[PDB]
Design an enzyme around this catalytic site. Structure first.
Site, PDB file in Angstrom:
ATOM      1  N   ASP A  25    -107.615  -2.449  26.290  1.00  0.00           N
ATOM      2  CA  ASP A  25    -106.842  -3.544  25.658  1.00  0.00           C
ATOM      3  C   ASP A  25    -106.879  -3.383  24.140  1.00  0.00           C
ATOM      4  O   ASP A  25    -107.834  -3.978  23.498  1.00  0.00           O
ATOM      5  CB  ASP A  25    -107.362  -4.876  26.137  1.00  0.00           C
ATOM      6  CG  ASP A  25    -106.491  -6.041  25.720  1.00  0.00           C
ATOM      7  OD1 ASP A  25    -105.564  -5.746  24.899  1.00  0.00           O
ATOM      8  OD2 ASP A  25    -106.697  -7.159  26.207  1.00  0.00           O
ATOM      9  N   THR A  26    -105.950  -2.651  23.565  1.00  0.00           N
ATOM     10  CA  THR A  26    -105.884  -2.523  22.089  1.00  0.00           C
ATOM     11  C   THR A  26    -105.674  -3.859  21.383  1.00  0.00           C
ATOM     12  O   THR A  26    -106.014  -3.897  20.139  1.00  0.00           O
ATOM     13  CB  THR A  26    -104.859  -1.480  21.666  1.00  0.00           C
ATOM     14  OG1 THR A  26    -103.579  -1.955  22.108  1.00  0.00           O
ATOM     15  CG2 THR A  26    -105.116  -0.076  22.199  1.00  0.00           C
ATOM     16  N   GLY A  27    -105.193  -4.897  22.027  1.00  0.00           N
ATOM     17  CA  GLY A  27    -105.053  -6.238  21.480  1.00  0.00           C
ATOM     18  C   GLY A  27    -106.294  -7.061  21.400  1.00  0.00           C
ATOM     19  O   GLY A  27    -106.204  -8.257  21.009  1.00  0.00           O
TER      20      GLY A  27
HETATM   21  C1  LIG Z   1    -103.967 -11.605  20.578  1.00  0.00           C
HETATM   22  C2  LIG Z   1    -104.392 -11.992  21.994  1.00  0.00           C
HETATM   23  C3  LIG Z   1    -103.202 -12.111  22.902  1.00  0.00           C
HETATM   24  C4  LIG Z   1    -105.436 -11.014  22.501  1.00  0.00           C
HETATM   25  N1  LIG Z   1    -105.760 -10.996  23.944  1.00  0.00           N
HETATM   26  C5  LIG Z   1    -105.658  -9.673  24.591  1.00  0.00           C
HETATM   27  C6  LIG Z   1    -104.371  -9.415  25.350  1.00  0.00           C
HETATM   28  O1  LIG Z   1    -104.243  -8.018  25.583  1.00  0.00           O
HETATM   29  C7  LIG Z   1    -104.312 -10.149  26.705  1.00  0.00           C
HETATM   30  C8  LIG Z   1    -105.366  -9.638  27.708  1.00  0.00           C
HETATM   31  C9  LIG Z   1    -105.235 -10.326  29.034  1.00  0.00           C
HETATM   32  C10 LIG Z   1    -105.079  -9.577  30.189  1.00  0.00           C
HETATM   33  C11 LIG Z   1    -104.913 -10.196  31.414  1.00  0.00           C
HETATM   34  C12 LIG Z   1    -104.881 -11.560  31.500  1.00  0.00           C
HETATM   35  C13 LIG Z   1    -105.008 -12.318  30.361  1.00  0.00           C
HETATM   36  C14 LIG Z   1    -105.173 -11.707  29.128  1.00  0.00           C
HETATM   37  N2  LIG Z   1    -102.966 -10.032  27.261  1.00  0.00           N
HETATM   38  C15 LIG Z   1    -102.232 -11.138  27.417  1.00  0.00           C
HETATM   39  O2  LIG Z   1    -102.472 -12.256  26.976  1.00  0.00           O
HETATM   40  O3  LIG Z   1    -101.089 -10.781  28.057  1.00  0.00           O
HETATM   41  C16 LIG Z   1    -100.090 -11.772  28.221  1.00  0.00           C
HETATM   42  C17 LIG Z   1     -99.253 -11.947  26.989  1.00  0.00           C
HETATM   43  C18 LIG Z   1     -97.932 -11.323  27.367  1.00  0.00           C
HETATM   44  O4  LIG Z   1     -98.234 -10.376  28.341  1.00  0.00           O
HETATM   45  C19 LIG Z   1     -99.113 -11.148  29.180  1.00  0.00           C
HETATM   46  S1  LIG Z   1    -106.984 -11.928  24.506  1.00  0.00           S
HETATM   47  O5  LIG Z   1    -107.110 -11.568  25.881  1.00  0.00           O
HETATM   48  O6  LIG Z   1    -106.662 -13.268  24.195  1.00  0.00           O
HETATM   49  C20 LIG Z   1    -108.512 -11.559  23.703  1.00  0.00           C
HETATM   50  C21 LIG Z   1    -108.803 -12.134  22.483  1.00  0.00           C
HETATM   51  C22 LIG Z   1    -109.999 -11.851  21.862  1.00  0.00           C
HETATM   52  C23 LIG Z   1    -110.924 -10.975  22.438  1.00  0.00           C
HETATM   53  N3  LIG Z   1    -112.114 -10.700  21.817  1.00  0.00           N
HETATM   54  C24 LIG Z   1    -110.611 -10.406  23.673  1.00  0.00           C
HETATM   55  C25 LIG Z   1    -109.408 -10.691  24.290  1.00  0.00           C
END
Ligand SMILES: CC(C)CN(C[C@@H](O)[C@H](Cc1ccccc1)NC(=O)O[C@H]1CCOC1)S(=O)(=O)c1ccc(N)cc1
Lengths: 99, 99
Positions: A25-27
């Site tokens: 997860d690069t995000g």
């Molecule tokens: C900027 C935010 C969005 C960053 N997130 C990462 C994102 O990759 C996040 C990962 C994820 C995967 C599966 C289910 C739910 C979430 N994908 C996400 O929300 O997918 C949605 C938006 C559209 O596509 C679907 S986080 O999970 O909030 C996060 C925040 C801080 C830390 N330390 C770790 C994780």
């Protein structure tokens, strides 16, 4: 390895003798796992994502194998709809994004 | 380009004549932007993240430039603490993760 992004970038992890899968997860700044109990001391921490915030247990200097690469770093334990490997650990793999 | 993950993988985007920044997010299936208003018809959609669910507007066939590469695809508009480019658009860049 090199992987494309037509499907989710899911890898196998091993942590505390337990095998799981997790999303590269690069995000995500930090690594977050739900389905894993870790031993020892931890610190309460709140993380923010889309939709709001979750209470997590922060465990430091956790040994973890990610797609075959042993690293040690911080692992957060708490509710997440997907186990995620964040940049904290992907930097220890030397991971790059290419386009 | 090739980038490492010691800092957030933020890129410049242009969409609807507006310039923004966004995070390249391998953990996100879809692209989500907050700070931009797009023209035309849309569909209500709920997305789920770490911390619950948000109501988004789905806009289809949206022209968008990501780090200089013109693509066309689906862009969700709604509350997100960070603009994110998801795999829907990163696949159109031929993006790979390497480690
Ligand atoms: C900027 C935010 C969005 C960053 N997130 C990462 C994102 O990759 C996040 C990962 C994820 C995967 C599966 C289910 C739910 C979430 N994908 C996400 O929300 O997918 C949605 C938006 C559209 O596509 C679907 S986080 O999970 O909030 C996060 C925040 C801080 C830390 N330390 C770790 C994780």
């Amino acid at each position: 390895p090199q992987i494309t992004l037509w499907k989710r970038p899911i890898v196998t992890i091993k942590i505390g003798g337990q095998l799981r899968e997790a999303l590269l997860d690069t995000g995500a700044d930090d690594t977050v796992l739900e389905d894993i109990d870790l031993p020892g001391r931890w610190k309460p921490k709140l993380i923010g994502g889309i939709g709001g915030f979750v209470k997590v247990r922060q465990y430091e200097q956790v040994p973890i194998e990610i797609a075959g690469h042993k690293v040690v770093g911080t692992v957060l334990i708490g509710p997440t709809p997907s186990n995620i490997i964040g940049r904290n650990l992907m930097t220890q793999l030397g991971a790059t994004l290419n386009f």
